[PDB]
């Protein structure tokens, strides 16, 4: 099979993108990053284990998730930060590998590269950008889900880590961000 | 099980939206537009069994093209026409089935629904609309293909692609304009290269 880097955490939908590559031939090889500060890939690890998937935790500079902090406390809306790390981000991994992926959904509004975004990282760095989830709505990926995973409330992306930093700095992380977690703890079906 | 109707051309990438529809676990029923200018849906067809999935032809309106026509003419590239003639065809099929997939790509512009588009026409009609292709740039598409189908070209000018185009050209042909003049390869999917 082809090989692909997946940004990978942990969630229903972010095992969807996993398992759709699978499906098309790919060799999914999932990856989470961390900046250090604290291990908020568990989840991500554990999930990756349950859907029999290779997986990575790459580190990253602590310095991008500290000026996503300044971006939050800057803007008070997280988009612009988490624009910030996620761009960042791609544009580290495409130095290393050929083909990424991630779970960037339809209905997601960040994080998301514009289409000039997309065209120029492919052909700044000559990789494949892929987003298997961009076609699919809500709805289906929810419908989806839930034929491909057994699924339990539970009550691993850059926001654990970003909100630590924040608590350190004197800031409540509540302020900047909602209140919503749901756990992949089987497969139904076999990917 | 749940079935999804699938507009479908019969090229490599369309084909690629119902094979990766099937590897998701949906019953993928193939459609394809006519306009009843000409049999331009004969590709597709052949395409259908190939991949071994249903397909059915729906017969539409052929004011839809008329129209198409007549944009084609003013706007002398088909953007705009392929847009109305889509669009129109998705909010006459969305009263009909209540998951519609297409075709659609990252890549190419034209024809494609904007997001608002899309929640649109989910919310008015209460329907599903999936774009498999959506997320997967032409670079992607190209391997994807090469590694499911058997291919080859199809010259020019002899076999008739499915898609709204030839049934636009007719028109255009009849009108007494040319046709060369805005729409000037083809790939064949002649088998698999694996089972789906």
Redesign the interface.
């Known amino acids: 099979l ?1 090989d692909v880097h997946v940004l990978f955490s942990g969630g229903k939908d972010s095992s969807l993108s996993a398992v ?1 590559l699978k ?3 790919y060799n999914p090889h999932l990856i989470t990053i961390n900046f250090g500060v604290i291990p908020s890939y568990k989840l991500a690890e554990e999930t990756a284990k349950i859907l029999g998937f290779k997986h990575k935790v790459i580190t990253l500079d602590r310095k991008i998730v500290e000026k996503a902090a300044d971006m939050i406390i800057e803007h008070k809306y997280p988009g612009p930060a988490i624009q910030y790390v996620h761009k960042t981000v791609l544009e580290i991994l495409a130095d290393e590998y050929s083909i990424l992926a991630d779970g ?1 959904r ?1 209905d997601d509004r960040v994080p998301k590269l514009s ?1 000039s975004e ?1 065209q120029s990282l ?1 052909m700044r760095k000559n990789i ?10 809500y ?2 990926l929810r ?2 889900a839930s ?1 491909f995973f057994i699924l339990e409330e539970i009550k691993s992306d850059y926001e654990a880590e970003i909100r630590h930093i924040l608590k350190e700095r004197g800031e409540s992380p509540e302020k900047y961000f909602p209140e919503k977690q749901t756990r992949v703890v089987g497969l139904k ?1 076999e990917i």
């Open positions: 082809m759709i499906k098309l031939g960037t339809r289409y997309i492919e494949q950008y892929i987003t298997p989830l961009m076609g699919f709505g709805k289906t419908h989806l034929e079906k």
